[PDB]
Design a protein around this ligand. Structure first.
Ligand code: 53X
Ligand code: ZN
Length: 257
């Protein structure tokens, strides 16, 4: 089964998931000088005031903070999107060292981590149907750099001890994801894919230009999680990122000049 190690990591995924070598795979390097400003792109509309977080889960590859997506409570619209996309979960990718961890790169620069807020297009009725469509998902990606602490991240950091190992979950109600956003919603956008198996080509990516800052102590706590289940030999959950994939026949558009 797939993972991030030498023997089951990103270079092996194509054997079980051939679409790994497809025409719209993610992540990609964002070459800032080649991205095209698109004046027709609208501002993002991030409406998270009624978000209902439920649970946090260590799934053996990352941790997911899950939301109630049975009603339009936390939605993303605008930008490149047509229609309404409901927030289902967010998760991160991070490194073993502060100089790596992000999936997207910016002029080949790697950030320490990357946050993915995953949303699905309500015209497809449920997430499982949405992932089978080329416009099924919208993922908002936010870079993390190490510097000052992010206060809105601390509640996530402090629960990680309770979900150390694969398959553990904990109640995670009343978390406000607005506390994870940077000031600016300027963004780049391109058509891509899930970045873990099954690697489905169903995502409109919206990557914010402005990173958030988190403290060294906050990211250190991410690195204490485990890929393994309880009672198995400890394997630290680090370097759970897929590297940049070929851009192929795609253009990255910028919302800003
Ligand atoms: C582990 C199997 N699996 C993993 C995912 C998945 C992978 C990702 C991702 O790369 O962010 N998401 C948001 N969801 C998935 C989606 C539909 C059906 C099965 C899936
Ligand atoms: Zn992700």
């Amino acid at each position: 089964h797939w993972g991030y190690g030498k023997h089951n990591g990103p270079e092996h995924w194509h054997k079980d998931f051939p679409i790994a070598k497809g025409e719209r795979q993610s992540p990609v390097d964002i070459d800032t000088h080649t991205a095209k400003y698109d004046p027709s792109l609208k501002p993002l509309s991030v409406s998270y005031d009624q978000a209902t977080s439920l649970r946090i889960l260590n799934n053996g590859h990352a941790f997911n903070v899950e939301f109630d997506d049975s009603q339009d409570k936390a939605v993303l619209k605008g930008g490149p999107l047509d229609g309404t996309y409901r927030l289902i979960q967010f998760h991160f990718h991070w490194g073993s060292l502060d100089g790596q961890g992000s999936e997207h790169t910016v002029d080949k620069k790697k950030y320490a981590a990357e946050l993915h807020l995953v949303h699905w297009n309500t015209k497809y009725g449920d997430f499982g149907k949405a992932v089978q469509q080329p416009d099924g998902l919208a993922v908002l990606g936010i870079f993390l750099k190490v510097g000052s602490a992010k206060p809105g991240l601390q509640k996530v950091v402090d629960v990680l001890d309770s979900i150390k190992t694969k398959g553990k979950s904990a109640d995670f109600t009343n978390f406000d994801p607005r506390g994870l956003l940077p000031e600016s919603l300027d963004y780049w956008t391109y058509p891509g894919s899930l970045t873990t198996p099954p690697l489905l080509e169903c995502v409109t990516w919206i990557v914010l230009k402005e990173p958030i800052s988190v403290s060294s102590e906050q990211v250190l706590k991410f690195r204490k999680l485990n890929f393994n289940g309880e009672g198995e030999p400890e394997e630290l959950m680090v370097d759970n990122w897929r590297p940049a994939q070929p851009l192929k026949n795609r253009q990255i558009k910028a919302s800003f000049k």
